[PDB]
């Protein structure tokens, strides 16, 4: 099956002492057919060990994992996206505080989604940041650390679920958060929480 | 040395070239205690082989490989000798004794060939403990790759061929078939299973229990009534003891008959088998190569009288207990292996790519 | 030079006039020896000249007697050996893999020695073919079996003689009319203690219901698994298929020909009508058409198993063996 | 990104319309390679995902088995090329070169099939065909050029009368041809000497996916001991294993009362297959597919 070939494999290392810190995923050469299907997001290969491959052009990412499936490829990196493309606010603001480091209410507001204050999403959403082969490890590690699972696909599903939960809490509409760019959603939510308090 | 097991009863003329033993008559009664000419692990393994304490082909292969690991662990090299030759020459009588206890299965033969190739490949300059550890690791890796990952891949492949609301007919006991059905039910497929069983082993009951413990609806019947149930059957799924170079399926007796009756009812036939059970030999019928079990197992108590009791009193009476049969490749629609979905005619091709 | 030319002319005339080497193995050995002498004596610089010379000689021998496929098979085997040696000494099949993932003028001094040693190894393997085939007799014959044969096949005779050393069975031999060579097979098998029956081909169907399996030889094996056998073998195969009786072809690997059954009107060998209708019939011979085909075409679907020096195989795998022996560019020759 | 869905569909349709002789699979492979030419990507993962989406939308344009076969073959070609070169620039150059060579090789498969298949046609033979097929037309042209005389029967193919088009194309080169109903397959089988058909897709076990009326003709030829030959190109080798007619994917049956457009023919009903690889038994297709995928 052509959909099972893997150029690189994500090796996950999880430390028991703290899941939100030092838990990482590296990428190693595979160059062979994997046992399961593969999903592509921002040049990142996710094995579909717990979810199944899906097809179509559904509007939201939730429309896929609500059926226990994941799209073959979605996000800005792909020319034609299974999810409906959309834009999020406060991207320029995120690029602005990309220079700001981790150094009261602001810390509690920015503690999301890890629960421990962090400012990596600002560097993620910065305009100087470019997506390629060198940024797979850090982005996938952030996704892994945000969720609580040993599988990347489950971590992505949980990340989108918590994004939707925070959007419900803050009163934003569901249709404006579909999962096209998870990290842009995280940055927009963090910026909204920061400006709120 | 090791004495020769005595044949029991009178054999059919067409099957006079095959051995036929008695379950009660063991060989270790003529062997020393403690065992000296035969390693104790091999003695115990042959004892459970002859008594039928382990029966499945995968189970027999796993037990043989564990006993071989124990023998290699307990082995020591003799002065002025080489590991590669001495180990094989020492293992040969153990395999002869095991064959005397019960004829070796195809998976057992393939495992023996693999282990002999691995032992012959051990370098002379290699240290004894390093060589033993490498052999044990090779045996463990062989078990892992050829059984567990192969079964997982076969189940993943067979999930795509199982749909909601279909009827799957299974025969006897096969770990691969039960595993496939269990994962298919687990992932969310909804179906029912029809279990076919035959005397005197009645191994199918085993599978039935597994299905009952998995929540899968199941039905039970004997092989002669199979033609009654195939009209409602959507597909037939069969395990295989071996796949031969001509594409024929060597399996438990009654498999070829079930395939023929399914063909008469226009239902697809799928055979699941790991690639390590593929054999280079060919066989056109069940007469040239087969196993003769204990004829006394055919005796059944129907009412208050056993008609086959003291059957050896009648000079012309013979009791035939065939173990295996051969299904021609034209009676099998699909073969499921860890390599993918292939036809029977592709069996030699796999044999070409696995060897080199 | 002159001696090689005389040998080639004698071989061609013997093929044209019939007779010569009765055994197929003997004919293969003579063809290999002739090709080796051609390679040694004739002058060539690079692989291309040698291949063209071998192609011309093989074309001549094949045109001498098209029904003798062993000579052409040997020529193509030698050509494939030359190609393999040149590729091994110079560089480092058509498939989807080759299609997706993307010159014999060079001269080498040691190429000739490699070709000669490969030919010698091929001859050595050829010498032990019959024993290799016969060593598998016990795996296919059980006690008190009934075997049916047609004509006189030396490979089948060796098979049955080896099997009879340890098992008792019955053999039925059909006399391949008009040249009733089955009588020689029957008397030879009876001399070895095997119980044998002599019958005509007209009874092949009648007794087929009491036959356990059929073991036959062949003259040629086609690329699709079809057989060029003695006449009457198609009827025997049809009768065996009617009763689902397994049919075993004991044929060495050197009888495989990469040709296909597309060729017509040259497949069967037509001989003088005297074998079928004697000249003493008289006037009625003026207005009667008499045809005596020697060979018959057997479709691959009527064959159960092929037993060769490399083991047992299904007909559906024959192509792969044909891919391992001959280059696709040498089929036309 | 570059060349969105509209441009891809336009290029595919333009390639199909400009050269009506070119098959759908060849046009799809050309569109995929010309997409590969201008991608402006830096990673092989995004390239693979973009090519997969392009194949998805192309199969959305045309519901034929051959388009999907070409898409899978192109994906395997990309994976094989990536396996040898790690750097993306060198890999892309090698992919472009190998794709040009692949297009050149697949553009002349029809002539090879004709030259290898016309020998099986005898003088005075009666050829039975099912529907319109460029490969069958080419093999009959090659047989005619060999100064051979034969007659051809063709069914009308009721859904779309491509049999009439085949009959006119055969009359163009002065070939005695006859048009029969789709219900006259069994009636006329006894008069035909051999049957030659095309195939939209060759499945793993050696069977074929073809026009809706192929299975009837194959079964009728089997019932009367008539040879059944299939001419098909290499790029139509699909890794599909249907068990019956219902097991064929629905994306190929419809949109191309109950009116399926294709059917499956088992390998046991096929005598030989004529491909650019040569004359093969149905068992060789599975070997080829196994060798391709490691």
UniProtKB/Swiss-Prot annotation, chain A:
The organism's superkingdom is given as Viruses
Membership in a protein family: Belongs to the phlebovirus NS-S protein family.
Know the name of this protein?
Non-structural protein NS-S
Q: Which residues of the full protein are shown?
A: 7 to 210 of 267
Swiss-Prot record, chain B:
**Could you confirm whether the keyword Protease appears in this record?**
no
Cellular compartments per GO CC: cytoplasm; cytosol; eukaryotic translation initiation factor 2B complex
Spell out the activity regulation: Activated by the chemical integrated stress response (ISR) inhibitor ISRIB which stimulates guanine nucleotide exchange factor activity for both phosphorylated and unphosphorylated eIF2.
Subcellular compartments: Cytoplasm, Cytosol
What is the recorded phenotype of mutating residue 324 to H?
In VWM4; with ovarian failure
Positions of region (May bind the chemical integrated stress response (ISR) inhibitor ISRIB): 5-14
Q: Which UniProt keywords apply?
A: Acetylation, Cytoplasm, Disease variant, Initiation factor, Leukodystrophy, Phosphoprotein, Protein biosynthesis
Principal subcellular localization? cytoplasm
Q: Look up the record and give one Gene Ontology term from the biological process aspect.
A: regulation of translation
Q: What GO molecular function terms would the record report?
A: guanyl-nucleotide exchange factor activity; translation initiation factor activity; translation initiation factor binding
> Please, which domain of life does this record's source organism belong to?
Eukaryota
Question: Is Disulfide bond among this UniProt entry's keywords?
Answer: no
Q: Which cysteines are joined by disulfide bonds?
A: none
Family, per the entry?
Belongs to the eIF-2B alpha/beta/delta subunits family.
Q: Which disease is it linked to?
A: Leukoencephalopathy with vanishing white matter 4: An autosomal recessive brain disease characterized by neurological features including progressive cerebellar ataxia, spasticity, and cognitive deficits. Brain imaging shows abnormal white matter that vanishes over time and is replaced by cerebrospinal fluid. Disease severity ranges from fatal infantile forms to adult forms without neurological deterioration. The disease is progressive with, in most individuals, additional episodes of rapid deterioration following febrile infections or minor head trauma.
Which species is this UniProt entry from?
Answer: Homo sapiens (Human)
Summarize which stretch of the complete protein this chain spans. Answer: 166 to 521 of 523
UniProtKB/Swiss-Prot annotation, chain C:
Question: A GO term (biological process) for this protein?
Answer: myelination
Impact upon substituting residue 195 to G: In VWM2; with and without ovarian failure
List cellular component terms (GO). Answer: cytoplasm; cytosol; eukaryotic translation initiation factor 2B complex
GO terms for molecular function, please?
A: ATP binding; GTP binding; guanyl-nucleotide exchange factor activity; translation initiation factor activity
Activity regulation remarks: Activated by the chemical integrated stress response (ISR) inhibitor ISRIB which stimulates guanine nucleotide exchange factor activity for both phosphorylated and unphosphorylated eIF2.
Q: Which cellular compartments is it found in?
A: Cytoplasm, Cytosol
UniProt KW keywords: Cytoplasm, Disease variant, Initiation factor, Leukodystrophy, Protein biosynthesis
Q: What is the effect of changing residue 109 to V?
A: Found in a patient with Rett syndrome-like phenotype; uncertain significance
Q: Which Gene3D superfamilies match?
A: Translation initiation factor eif-2b, domain 2
Q: Which disease is it linked to?
A: Leukoencephalopathy with vanishing white matter 2: An autosomal recessive brain disease characterized by neurological features including progressive cerebellar ataxia, spasticity, and cognitive deficits. Brain imaging shows abnormal white matter that vanishes over time and is replaced by cerebrospinal fluid. Disease severity ranges from fatal infantile forms to adult forms without neurological deterioration. The disease is progressive with, in most individuals, additional episodes of rapid deterioration following febrile infections or minor head trauma.
* Name the UniProt record assigns to this protein: Translation initiation factor eIF2B subunit beta
Swiss-Prot record, chain D:
> Keyword annotations for this protein?
Acetylation, Cytoplasm, Disease variant, Initiation factor, Leukodystrophy, Protein biosynthesis
Q: Sorted alphabetically, which Gene3D superfamilies does this protein's record hold?
A: Translation initiation factor eif-2b, domain 2 (3.40.50.10470), Translation initiation factor eIF-2B, N-terminal domain (1.20.120.1070)
What activates or inhibits this protein? Activated by the chemical integrated stress response (ISR) inhibitor ISRIB which stimulates guanine nucleotide exchange factor activity for both phosphorylated and unphosphorylated eIF2.
Query: Does the keyword Cytoplasm belong to this entry?
Result: yes
Which biological process annotations from GO are given for this protein? cytoplasmic translational initiation; oligodendrocyte development; response to glucose; response to heat; response to peptide hormone; T cell receptor signaling pathway; translational initiation
PTM annotation (N6-acetyllysine): residues:
37
- Where, per UniProt, does this protein localize? Cytoplasm, Cytosol
Q: Does the keyword Acetylation apply?
A: yes
Q: Which GO terms describe its molecular function?
A: guanyl-nucleotide exchange factor activity; identical protein binding; translation initiation factor activity
Q: Which GO terms describe its cellular component?
A: cytoplasm; cytosol; eukaryotic translation initiation factor 2B complex; membrane; plasma membrane
- Primary localization: cytoplasm
Q: By its UniProt entry, which Pfam families does this protein fall under? A: IF-2B
Q: Which family does it belong to?
A: Belongs to the eIF-2B alpha/beta/delta subunits family.
* Stated name of the protein: Translation initiation factor eIF2B subunit alpha
Q: Per UniProt, what is the name of the gene that codes for the protein in this document?
A: EIF2B1
